[PDB]
A paper describes a structure:
Hydroxynitrile lyase from [name] (HbHNL) and the esterase SABP2 from Nicotiana tabacum share the α/β-hydrolase fold, a Ser–His–Asp catalytic triad and 44% sequence identity, yet catalyze different reactions. To investigate how regions beyond the active site influence catalytic efficiency and active-site geometry, we engineered HbHNL variants with increasing numbers of substitutions to match SABP2. Variant HNL16 has all amino acids within 6.5 Å of the active site identical to SABP2, HNL40 those within 10 Å and HNL71 those within 14 Å. HNL16 exhibited poor esterase activity, whereas both HNL40 and HNL71 showed efficient esterase catalysis, demonstrating that residues beyond the immediate active site are critical for functional conversion.
Variant HNL71 contains 31 additional substitutions beyond those in HNL40, giving a total of 71, which corresponds to removing approximately one half (49%) of the differences between the proteins. These 31 additional substitutions increase the sequence identity to SABP2 to 71% for HNL71 and expand the region of identical protein sequence with SABP2 to 14 Å from salicylic acid bound in the active site of SABP2. The 31 additional substitutions in HNL71 further increase the kcat value fourfold to 310 min−1, making HNL71 a 2.4-fold better esterase than SABP2. Although the sequence of HNL71 is closer to that of HbHNL (72% sequence identity) by ten amino acids than to SABP2 (68% sequence identity), it shows no significant hydroxynitrile lyase activity and instead is a 2.4-fold better esterase than SABP2. The χ1 angles at histidine, serine and OX2 are within 7° of those in SABP2. Thus, the 71 changes introduced to create HNL71 create nearly, but not completely, identical catalytic atom positions. In HNL71, the data also lacked sufficient electron density to define nine residues in two surface regions: a two-residue segment Gly142-Lys143 in the cap domain and a seven-residue segment Met182-Glu183-Ile184-Leu185-Ala186-Lys187-Arg188 in the catalytic domain. During refinement of HNL71, the Fo − Fc (red/green) electron-density map revealed a notable density adjacent to the sulfur of Cys163 in both chains A and B. Placing an O atom into this density decreased the Rwork and Rfree values. This addition of an O atom suggests that Cys163 has been oxidized to a sulfenic acid in HNL71. The oxidation seen in HNL71 may be due to oxidative conditions encountered by the HNL71 crystal.
Author numbering: 2 to 141, 144 to 181, 189 to 260
């Protein structure tokens, strides 16, 4: 039927990356919330004030906490957004109909919370970051990420239009990758993975690896999708999300 989709962006991005998908879900009758996480999009915070992934997720937690009784949402997380999903699902699991991991980090419950990030780090040669800028800052020593135009063009948006890449160049902002996701909370939610097959930021092989590691309830494959499937495969993506809405409810 009709769901409430809560869309959670990835590193260096913001609510704006869902600007093509949201109207599509809304024309399907759904309610759609596309948050800015902390120090993302036009959030007024700067990355230097964020100490943890939990603090980065604050707007998501705040929004879920405000949800009235009976209201349940389908979380949709992109890239690093998948970790925001795990954080949110472990605090407000009673409010989550399902979580969708769009080419995202899917943590598990048997390994430590950062396992998929550590493993992603270990499989990723530093050359792959291209012109991405890594700096350090202090709060209370934290490494910041800032994607450069080459990385955006060559590893994230390579199958997107020039207006998509230019938009990201105009909006991306510094981010950061910064103990256990519980079986009772996060572990209990239905999870859906959307594989993006031409992804060069999180390669399909890593995406398949995470599914192997912690199998979700449904796996969709988006052929021809780079990492920003919501911009190049928006229509197909909305059709998967409708299938999800129809499956996970009453
Ligand atoms: Mg925004
Ligand atoms: Mg392009």
């Amino acid at each position: 039927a009709f769901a409430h989709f809560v869309l959670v962006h990835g590193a260096c991005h913001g609510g704006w990356s869902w600007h093509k998908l949201k109207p599509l879900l809304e024309a399907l009758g759904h309610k759609v919330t596309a948050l800015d996480l902390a120090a993302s999009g036009v959030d007024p915070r700067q990355i230097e004030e964020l100490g943890t992934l939990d603090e980065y997720t604050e707007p998501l937690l705040t929004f879920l906490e405000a949800l009235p009784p009976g209201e349940k949402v389908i979380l949709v997380g992109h890239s690093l957004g998948g970790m925001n999903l795990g954080i949110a699902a472990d605090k407000y699991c009673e409010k989550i109909a399902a979580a969708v991991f769009l080419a995202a980090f899917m943590p598990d419950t048997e390994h430590c919370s950062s396992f998929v990030l550590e493993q992603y780090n270990e499989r990723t040669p530093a050359e792959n970051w291209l012109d991405t800028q890594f700096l350090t800052y202090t709060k209370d020593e934290i490494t910041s990420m800032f994607f450069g135009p080459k990385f955006l063009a060559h590893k994230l948006y390579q199958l997107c239009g020039p207006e998509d890449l230019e938009l990201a160049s105009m909006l991306v902002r510094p981010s950061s990758l910064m103990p256990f996701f519980t079986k009772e909370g996060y572990g209990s939610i239905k999870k859906i993975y959307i594989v993006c097959t031409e992804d060069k930021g999180i390669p399909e092989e890593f995406q398949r690896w995470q599914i192997e590691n912690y199998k979700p309830d449904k796996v969709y494959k988006v052929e021809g999708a780079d990492h920003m499937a919501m911009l190049c495969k928006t229509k197909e993506l909305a059709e998967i999300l409708q299938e999800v809405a129809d499956t996970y409810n009453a």
